[PDB]
Amino acid sequence: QSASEQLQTDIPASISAMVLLNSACQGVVETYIDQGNAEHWYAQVEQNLNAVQKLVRQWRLSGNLYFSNDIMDSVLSIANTFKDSNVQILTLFKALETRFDTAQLQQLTSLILTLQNPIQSLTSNIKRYDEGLNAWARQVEDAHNTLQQTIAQIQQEEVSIQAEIIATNAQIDLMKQQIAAFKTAIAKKGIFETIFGVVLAPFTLGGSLILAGFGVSSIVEAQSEISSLQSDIQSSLNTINHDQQTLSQDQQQIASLNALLLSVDQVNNDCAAISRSLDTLQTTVLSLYNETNNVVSNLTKAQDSQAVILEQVWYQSAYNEWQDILEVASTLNNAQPQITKAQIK
Ligand code: NI
Ligand code: NI
């Protein structure tokens, strides 16, 4: 596998992990709890949750909604440099094959060397995005841990409903595993997104005191995996409602609090997955850099036509791969997101 062959896999994988974070962020923004008749503990839950939602709005103000715009533009710049220089490079390779010439050799070497400029920008833009993502993630995790600790204190004090609190927490933890199984399973291009809302502590006339959000997304359509995820989450919620039948609505509100962490926790997961995908992508981009450095070095040292054409297999293989990368990256950069919203009650 060459570097460019690997990048055919590694580049959509990183954009794949990025789109998920948009959906997790959207799940946070759409999570809501109303005070109702609650007393004493509500103010801090509301404060903690508002603190997490503020961090998402700050993150989105960067403009990196479905993916890093700077990483995408550096990919496109590499691909366009290949596309724009193909004929001049192939012309020189051909001429040099027939008769070695020092000036044309220096010319062809300068053309390959122009590939290294958008490659440096890509590697630098990956590090700058990863650094900002990791800084933000640590703040999200701190805020998640504050809200979690608030909820644990409230719940451990409601000694008369610990049976129903445990049965509900059990279902919430199953929903987390089902979300994780979906993401495992998905690991014609576009951006396809489903946002979920989970209704808890309902009112007889309609509505509820809690709306817990989460979201998933992918760059190829996967309507079947989404449906299985939705049926699993529905069945978990139906189980929660069955197990809370013996509680008042005010007790339902307390027993359901950890659903507020569902989408916050997914933000933590998704940030981590992007970073791992970017470590992997960084390694492959440096492997492309070092292939170009080896061609530049071999061209600089070549004395005859034979030395020169040995470097043309690297070039033509990379050109063709990069024209496929161009089409995928442009499709994804041009895509209008296709969003569907699912209420689970
Ligand atoms: Ni208290
Ligand atoms: Ni039962």
Numbering used by the authors: 6 to 192, 199 to 356
Paper text:
The proteins MakA/B/E can form a tripartite toxin that lyses erythrocytes and is cytotoxic to cultured human cells.
Its tail domain, 85 Å in length, consists of five long helices (α1, α2, α3, α6, and α7). β1 is very short and originates from the tail domain. Two molecules of MakE are found in the asymmetric unit, along with two nickel ions and four sulfate ions. MakE, which has the most prominent break of the α2-helix, has no proline at this position. In contrast, the hydrophobic region in MakE constitutes the first central β-strand (β2), the β-hairpin β3β4, and half of the next β-strand (β5). Similarly, an elongated form of MakE was modeled in which the tip of the long α3/α4 helices is hydrophobic, albeit the hydrophobic residues are more concentrated on one side.
